[PDB]
Write an enzyme that holds these catalytic residues in place. Structure first.
Site, PDB file in Angstrom:
ATOM      1  CG  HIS A 119     -26.420   1.818 -18.170  1.00  0.00           C
ATOM      2  ND1 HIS A 119     -26.769   1.738 -19.716  1.00  0.00           N
ATOM      3  CD2 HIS A 119     -27.655   1.844 -17.445  1.00  0.00           C
ATOM      4  CE1 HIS A 119     -27.597   2.767 -19.031  1.00  0.00           C
ATOM      5  NE2 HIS A 119     -28.727   2.177 -18.187  1.00  0.00           N
TER       6      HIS A 119
ATOM      7  CB  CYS B 288     -25.450   1.449 -24.926  1.00  0.00           C
ATOM      8  SG  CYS B 288     -25.592  -0.191 -26.402  1.00  0.00           S
ATOM      9  CG  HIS B 289     -27.135   4.285 -21.939  1.00  0.00           C
ATOM     10  ND1 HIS B 289     -27.344   2.842 -22.311  1.00  0.00           N
ATOM     11  CD2 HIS B 289     -28.425   4.471 -22.098  1.00  0.00           C
ATOM     12  CE1 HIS B 289     -28.628   2.572 -22.608  1.00  0.00           C
ATOM     13  NE2 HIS B 289     -29.098   3.483 -22.489  1.00  0.00           N
ATOM     14  N   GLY B 290     -22.648   5.479 -22.835  1.00  0.00           N
ATOM     15  CA  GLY B 290     -21.489   6.609 -22.155  1.00  0.00           C
ATOM     16  C   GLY B 290     -20.714   6.028 -21.624  1.00  0.00           C
TER      17      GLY B 290
END
Ligand code: HEC
Ligand code: HEM
Ligand code: HEM
Ligand code: HEM
Ligand code: HEM
Ligand SMILES: CO/C=C(/C(=O)OC)c1ccccc1Oc1cc(Oc2ccccc2C#N)ncn1
Ligand SMILES: CO/C=C(/C(=O)OC)c1ccccc1Oc1cc(Oc2ccccc2C#N)ncn1
Ligand SMILES: CCCCCCCCO[C@@H]1O[C@H](CO)[C@@H](O)[C@H](O)[C@H]1O
Ligand SMILES: CCCCCCCCO[C@@H]1O[C@H](CO)[C@@H](O)[C@H](O)[C@H]1O
Ligand code: FES
Ligand code: FES
Ligand SMILES: [Sr+2]
Ligand SMILES: [Sr+2]
Ligand SMILES: [Sr+2]
Lengths: 430, 175, 256, 430, 256, 175
Positions: free
Chosen positions: B119, B139-141
């Site tokens: 990502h 960080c974002h899943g």
């Protein structure tokens, strides 16, 4: 080659010096050059660029007395400057905002030259010397932004150095040579700092040739009608000496410009900046939006406007047998914007000098000025709809102006009679 | 005429001999060339234990998968994956994302891959985490399976696998 | 990501003649030391600057005693010791808690309108006003789309934009339908969590405002000195511009 | 101001270029200046200094791409260059020995100018521009030696910065301002590195005026007989053009010089160095012997020759009411050696140009040349007997040459008839 | 201080065509690892250079296993680990033991005659030859003037000059009457203290010579590369000088 | 005529206002100015214990002399010393090197002095060493007494005493 009067040594100290080193003579003939007396306010930016180059070198040298080019210390040494060095907080913002003042000046300096045809003959060499200064400026500021070693410092360098990898064949070697390794790291920061010191001196040398260039041919004016150089009595009607008439006119305009620049540095020094650059360099965390500074945005927009599904891009990838991929096309289109702007003496086939007397050209110019603002705006926007199309129409018109419109206009333009002399235009106003 | 041409050529050769060291100095230093590859001693790595190693600034995960982790890997079909590319530099780029192609040995016991989320480059947490018994990016899943393939999150592609091979019975050469 | 909404706080330091409120920076220092310091740090702020002018301006003995509470490894000896004013604040105790030295300049509160920069021109970057919106942006319950689908270990915040969102709250093309997102910071402020000496208001909003003002000074200690220099350069250049104007006028009067 | 022939544009590209920027003309008239044809091998050192300035800047910029100006990293980054950077070991020794080659050149360049009277009129401006270059060179080399941050780096900077403290009253402020603190530390290393980058460019600007200076008046020759400037037919007999006759003669001599310099760098690159500078900077351990490099030794000897018990020193301390202590006297005597050498056009009152035709001056000159070597030798010796006396006689004769001997000699010298023209002397030799 | 006497060793690397003896550097590496490493270090020498050309030239696997004996604190993690070739040799274990990375260029063996540098011109700096004189410069008994006055914890050495001297050995004006002085280093070399693989001579003289040669390579790994570059620059500049000479002659032949 | 002179004077003032910040930047930074003086907490310093503190890059010794150390200090006569100067910045330069003048308090209990050997700047070893019950320099063998005065060695002068004073009952302000 305008008729003026030579320098005569006056006092005794001047006669003793002129017979050994005529430096007082070179200062008199230079500062007393016949300049046209019809120059409008768009002829001040040369002096503003002159002030800027001194400002960046002075504050630049000072900031180097306290900066450490190392990944472990670069970000901290800059906050050491902000917090502890006497007035160091002002010196950075002067150096940082100073680049923006330095770059807004060239664009008004340049678009002046595009309107009034100051690039057309006999002024080709002033333009080419100008273009080289433009390249050294951008390369200088680019490497300067790496030195705080924030997020934008690291990732801006990571994207741009990656574009050199997109060159066919030799791209990987040039990237490795540039970076000094597999990726942006300390060797990159270490060498970028040295060249950031060097190129301003190289720029200083080019400004000497730049100033030697327009002094040889003489300053252009809003009419495009050259000064009469058949008799001293005629040239004096078209012109006034540089000192004191235009020295005070430029130094006045510089004071007004600095009155704004210091208000920016004094009250909004971070408006023209990215907050992410106050975040330390994180190779394991890409920012949400990698935005260059505003003076690089229009070239950033042209880079991203040419994605792999653009029709012109697909045609090139097929014709070139896969050599020109979507990325390398954007690279050529990004630097190609500079090249067509450098070749504009040989693409503008109109024999008319100033754009003041070119009705059809005047439309396409002001669309270029608007198009430049639009390119600067979409450079900060996402690749999503409709910004992908806005940049594609905008990138297209940039190359159409130089490669298509300007050559075609030279044949079909219906100009207007300019004045007979500069004297006519000066008295028509007063 | 030979003299005036030999003197010019000898000067040009001398100029070129002086310019090339000034270019090659910017090539990678001897210490950067030495980090092109590294050697890991996996003599004391039992099954289930993860071994994180630094390489080119970023971490690499070297997890010896257990009997349960290999079962979930080979059970997933090719249509259930978001990214069907193996992302391995050893085998060809067109190889499919089968569990047999995500490991170095035929037994599928050793899993070597970049510990860098595709990502935006965060480090996922290992040791059996997430909703698929693999790795989880905080960080974002982004959720990964036991084989290191993306199954849910903003991550577009799978974790790339470096050029790795066993030089001997108990040593792996990364890069 | 993008840019959401924030509460526009009338901070004292805003505007050309804006200056830090000394008592306010003292209150935020207490709120930092007793709340935020548990996870966050200020690796770039020297402790001695708490007695610097244009700031909290504590006596040097208080800062000397304040610095003793920190444990610091001596750069030469290597053994731990009580902290001096010469040392910086410690790093963030919690790993994923970002450092707060420059947070008031590392986050933008105002964006838009359409990437035109008109908002920041008249409202500023919005750093200290965005921090205020994160602390006071923790609602009671999550949104309706996120009931029973919150990621474990995260908390919803109205202002925070760079966080994950459950699939239940995303639209058809990945964009979130919530104002903010899920942040890993638990709500740190509670009503009257700090007892001020002068009995000043200690509500969550009042503390978030004071600590935001303090966090602005931590990012820019030299705010007040800069605005004096900016004002002074304007006065010199205004006079010099007016004199250079009249000189240019009289000088060209013998031509026109 | 010698009669030569103007440049004529030849091809079409030359006419196109000369009518816009006459850079090909300035390059032709410069490289075709009439130079006297009797120049001996002592006129090569100007060109050797030109090559040296390029070598130091080129290798200087390269070494800056890998050096870290920080106390914790400076010494290590230089050994990183020696051990890891491609060819970094050769580039350092070229930069280090290059300063010695750069400094042996000026002393032969200078002692040439002292013998042949190239400092006397009309060449005063060439001399003063020369002296300023000499100061920037020494200030440049001094700060460069600090950058490895070894023992000699730290303690050499500690002694010299302390001399500024010996100024009456304001001495402490200048030392604090220089050092940026109570003592030599990281702030000193950080700023010295910045100025070490700057001054070589400043030196380059002074060389431009330096070359503009002697081109205005013309090159001196061994006879001191100026070129005849009454007719082109006369100047051609006294002179030959610079290109190709003296370009090939100087480039020939440069190749011989580099053949020695590269053998030094290739086989004894540490002979001209101090081994103590391979020891990291230790503020808690003074070396046994703080020796400057050889090109600073004669000024170091003059500094230490004036101890507090010298009779001239005691007279000064008494007359000045204690203002001029023993330390401040040595400072004045050390910089005073430069000043008297700069004022030598106004201290040599003899109307004769070259020293070739001054018999009594010829003795005192060669005693100065021996005196310079002796000062360079005693600079490394101890302050004990007899070296305290050897340096004191040597320091004394230095000022006697410029302040006493040369003014007196102008009145009592019995010169010898020079040749009538340069043509006579050229045929007199062959 | 000053410069005393030293044993002039015919090292192989001396002279224009001098090159390191590969087997000798291997022996000196063994003597360093087993003797000098106990107190001294080489903080600037990378371990990987043991397989670099112009040096010991070991296989990389031996250097890889050689580096494992050292314990190194990881620059990132902070936990100790086995050493790699990418790491440098450790620091000096003993505090007042100076680092030996650059010892062969940090000491001068030859000086004089009268500070004129004529000796070093024909004999070189004398670094690796001075170390040989320190190791083999530990006599059986001290001088006669120092009997019963040695400083405790120090040892007399013939070559060492920068050490203390008892007042019994000083002259009327502070100068020492002894050849050397008292060094804090105990005599580190003993006969047959190391057993070489090929059964080479391991006397105190043979070990001091080999370890001295090794210490020269540690200070300058690129000695052999430099002399090839020096030889090459001579060849280009010698030919170009001869061509430039004749060119200058023919070119000036139309004047003289 | 005033206008053409006021315009010039206003420009010179602006130039001077811009030049002085370019000079003052090289003066000591705010972090160096903060080390101009330091504060030592001598609350837990018993007699006989030495306390070494860094100041201006070099160390300063702060030893609380015991009953025996003070006796040897006051017993030495002024003629037995090699250097009769006190080398103290507080009192006048012409003060004699008596034991009462080498301390801050009249009791002569606290001895504060630069821990820097005047020979060449080494750090002498403390804790009662040498042949005079004081400090011993291992670089060349300089012996000091309990009062910090040179008695034997290449060291010419005594150890200088900084500007020190007791701001309160248990704190000393150096510099
Ligand atoms: C641990 C119990 C915390 C305490 C107490 C406080 N903070 Fe914090 N903070 C913490 C974490 C783990 C994070 C990262 C959140 C994420 O999702 O990445 C943060 C973050 C912040 C931020 C940055 C927000 C952003 O946009 O990136 C700010 C401005 C912030 N926190 C402020 C803050 C203040 C003022 C506190 C004291 C009142 C405070 N935090 C306490 C962990 C913890
Ligand atoms: C630091 C950078 C620069 C400096 C200091 C500078 C300075 C000047 C000055 C003093 C002039 C005289 C008239 C005027 O003020 O307009 C001038 C003219 C001009 N410059 Fe520049 N300039 C710079 C950059 C550039 C660039 C980037 C370009 C084009 C790419 C350019 C092209 C021109 C042209 C075409 C003219 C008109 C010359 C004429 O009318 O004869 N310059 N410049
Ligand atoms: C002449 C044109 C110059 C331009 C366009 C330029 C541009 C820049 C820019 C954009 C930055 C980033 C500032 C920031 O965001 O923090 C920077 C930083 C820096 N520049 Fe320059 N610069 C110039 C001249 C110089 C010179 C001559 C030096 C010589 C020493 C120098 C030294 C530095 C240093 C040390 C930094 C890092 C410190 C800081 O960011 O304040 N600059 N430069
Ligand atoms: C970077 C340092 C220097 C360079 C590159 C340089 C360059 C030159 C060159 C090329 C010449 C003409 C050829 C020759 O005389 O051999 C010259 C002449 C001269 N230079 Fe220099 N020079 C330097 C330093 C100095 C110094 C330090 C001095 C005096 C203190 C000086 C004073 C003179 C004089 C007196 C002449 C003779 C002028 C004449 O014959 O008309 N120069 N220089
Ligand atoms: C007149 C021109 C120059 C002179 C006389 C000069 C002189 C010196 C000297 C004598 C040293 C010490 C060498 C050593 O101890 O190894 C040195 C070091 C250094 N100089 Fe220069 N230098 C000049 C130009 C430059 C320039 C233009 C730069 C930067 C662009 C530069 C960068 C350095 C660096 C980085 C060092 C430390 C690394 C080293 O010692 O090799 N020099 N300089
Ligand atoms: C180190 O990166 C610096 C940047 C910057 O804007 O500095 C002022 C930067 C930041 C983020 C992303 C990219 C950045 O650099 C650049 C540099 C750049 O320079 C060019 C300008 C015109 C044409 C081509 C290029 C390139 N490359 N054009 C666009 N972005
Ligand atoms: C950083 O110190 C560098 C030195 C050096 O020689 O560098 C090449 C140096 C080393 C040890 C001792 C002193 C040193 O510096 C200097 C510098 C120096 O420069 C001058 C030259 C002429 C007149 C005055 C000075 C001074 N100051 N004259 C003598 N020694
Ligand atoms: C465009 C040039 C206008 C002149 C400069 C005025 C800028 C005032 O701008 C104000 O500056 C304040 C100072 O901190 C900030 O706090 C405010 O956010 C900003 O709006
Ligand atoms: C003055 C011109 C000198 C020409 C080069 C002479 C080189 C001989 O010099 C010798 O070189 C050897 C190379 O290893 C070194 O061992 C010696 O130390 C050095 O003195
Ligand atoms: S960075 Fe790994 S998921 Fe966002
Ligand atoms: S240094 Fe202290 S005695 Fe020699
Ligand atoms: Sr399509
Ligand atoms: Sr507000
Ligand atoms: Sr030998």
């Amino acid at each position: 080659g305008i008729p003026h009067d030579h320098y005569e040594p006056r006092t005794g100290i001047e006669k003793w010096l002129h017979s050994r080193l005529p430096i007082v003579a070179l200062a008199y003939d230079t500062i007393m050059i016949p300049t046209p007396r019809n120059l409008n306010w768009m002829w001040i930016w040369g002096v503003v660029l002159a002030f800027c180059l001194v400002l960046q070198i002075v504050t630049g040298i000072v900031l180097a007395m306290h900066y450490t080019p190392h990944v472990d210390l670069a970000f901290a040494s800059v906050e050491h400057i902000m917090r502890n060095v006497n007035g160091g907080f002002m010196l950075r913002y002067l150096h940082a905002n100073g680049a923006s003042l330095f770059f807004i000046a060239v664009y008004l300096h340049i678009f002046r030259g595009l309107y009034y045809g100051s690039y057309k003959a006999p002024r080709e060499v002033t333009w080419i010397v100008g273009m080289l200064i433009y390249l050294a400026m951008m390369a200088t500021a680019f490497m300067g932004y790496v030195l705080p070693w924030g997020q934008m410092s690291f990732w801006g360098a990571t994207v741009i150095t990656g574009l050199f990898g997109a060159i066919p064949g030799i791209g990987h070697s040039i990237q490795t040579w540039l970076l000094g390794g597999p990726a942006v790291d300390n060797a990159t920061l270490n060498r970028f700092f040295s060249l950031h010191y060097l190129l301003p001196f190289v720029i200083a040398a080019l400004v000497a040739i730049h100033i030697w260039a327009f002094h040889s041919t003489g300053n252009n004016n809003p009419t495009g009608v050259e000064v009469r150089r058949t008799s001293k009595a005629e040239a004096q009607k078209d012109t006034v000496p540089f000192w004191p008439y235009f020295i005070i006119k430029d130094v006045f305009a510089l004071a007004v410009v600095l009155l704004v620049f210091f208000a920016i540095v004094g009250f909004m020094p971070n408006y023209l900046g990215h907050p992410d650059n106050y975040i330390e360099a994180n190779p394991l965390s890409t920012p949400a939006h990698i935005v260059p500074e505003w003076y690089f945005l229009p070239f950033y927009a042209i880079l991203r406007a040419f994605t792999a599904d653009v029709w012109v891009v697909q045609i090139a990838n097929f014709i070139s047998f896969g050599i020109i991929d979507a990325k390398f096309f954007g690279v050529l289109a990004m630097f190609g914007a500079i090249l067509v702007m450098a070749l504009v003496p040989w693409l503008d086939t109109s024999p008319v000098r100033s754009g003041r007397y070119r009705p059809m050209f005047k439309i396409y110019f002001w669309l270029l000025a608007a198009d430049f603002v639009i390119l600067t705006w979409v450079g900060a926007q996402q690749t999503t709809f409709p910004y992908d199309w806005i940049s594609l129409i905008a990138s297209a018109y940039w190359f159409a102006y130089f490669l298509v419109i300007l050559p075609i206009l030279g044949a079909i333009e219906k100009p207007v009679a300019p004045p007979a002399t500069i004297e006519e235009d000066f008295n028509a106003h007063y | 005429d030979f003299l005036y041409y030999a003197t010019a050529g000898a000067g040009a050769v001398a100029t070129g001999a002086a310019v090339w060291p000034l270019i090659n100095q910017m090539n990678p230093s001897a210490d950067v060339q030495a980090l092109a590859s590294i050697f890991v001693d996996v003599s004391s790595v039992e099954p289930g234990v993860q071994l994180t190693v630094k390489f080119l600034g970023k971490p690499i995960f070297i997890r010896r998968r257990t009997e349960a982790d290999i079962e979930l890997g080979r059970s997933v079909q090719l249509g259930q994956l978001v990214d069907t590319n193996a992302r391995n530099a050893n085998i060809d780029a067109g190889a499919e994302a089968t569990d047999q192609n995500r490991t170095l040995d035929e037994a599928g016991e050793w899993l070597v891959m970049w510990g860098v989320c595709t990502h935006l480059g965060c480090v996922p947490i290992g040791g059996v985490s997430g909703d698929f018994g693999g790795w989880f990016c905080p960080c974002h899943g982004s959720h990964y399976d036991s084989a290191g393939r993306i199954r849910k999150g903003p991550a577009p592609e799978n974790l790339p696998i470096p050029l790795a091979k066993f030089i001997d019975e108990t040593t792996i050469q990364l890069g | 990501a993008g840019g959401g909404h924030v509460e526009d706080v009338p901070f004292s330091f805003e505007g050309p003649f804006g200056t830090f409120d000394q008592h306010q920076l003292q209150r935020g220092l207490q709120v930092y030391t007793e709340v935020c310091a548990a996870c966050h740090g200020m690796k770039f702020v020297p402790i001695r600057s708490l007695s610097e002018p244009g700031g909290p301006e504590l006596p040097e003995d208080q800062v000397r005693a304040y610095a003793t509470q920190f444990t610091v490894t001596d750069e030469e000896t290597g053994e731990d010791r009580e902290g001096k004013p010469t040392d910086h604040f410690p790093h963030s105790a919690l790993e994923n808690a970002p450092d707060l030295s420059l947070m008031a300049k590392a986050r933008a509160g105002f964006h838009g309108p359409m990437g035109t920069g008109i908002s920041q021109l008249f409202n500023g970057i919005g750093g200290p006003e965005y921090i205020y919106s994160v602390l006071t942006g923790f609602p009671e319950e999550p949104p309706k789309c996120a009931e029973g689908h919150e990621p474990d270990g995260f908390y919803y915040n109205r202002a925070f934009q760079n966080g994950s969102v459950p699939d239940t709250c995303k639209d058809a093309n990945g964009v979130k339908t919530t104002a903010g997102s899920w942040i890993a910071m638990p709500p740190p402020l509670m009503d009257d969590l700090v007892e001020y000496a002068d009995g000043h208001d200690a509500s969550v909003h009042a503390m978030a405002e004071d600590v935001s003002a303090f966090l602005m000074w931590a990012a820019e200690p030299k705010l007040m000195a800069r605005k004096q220099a900016g004002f002074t350069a304007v006065m010199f250049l205004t006079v010099l511009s007016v004199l250079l104007y009249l000189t240019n006028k009289r000088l060209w009067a013998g031509v026109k």
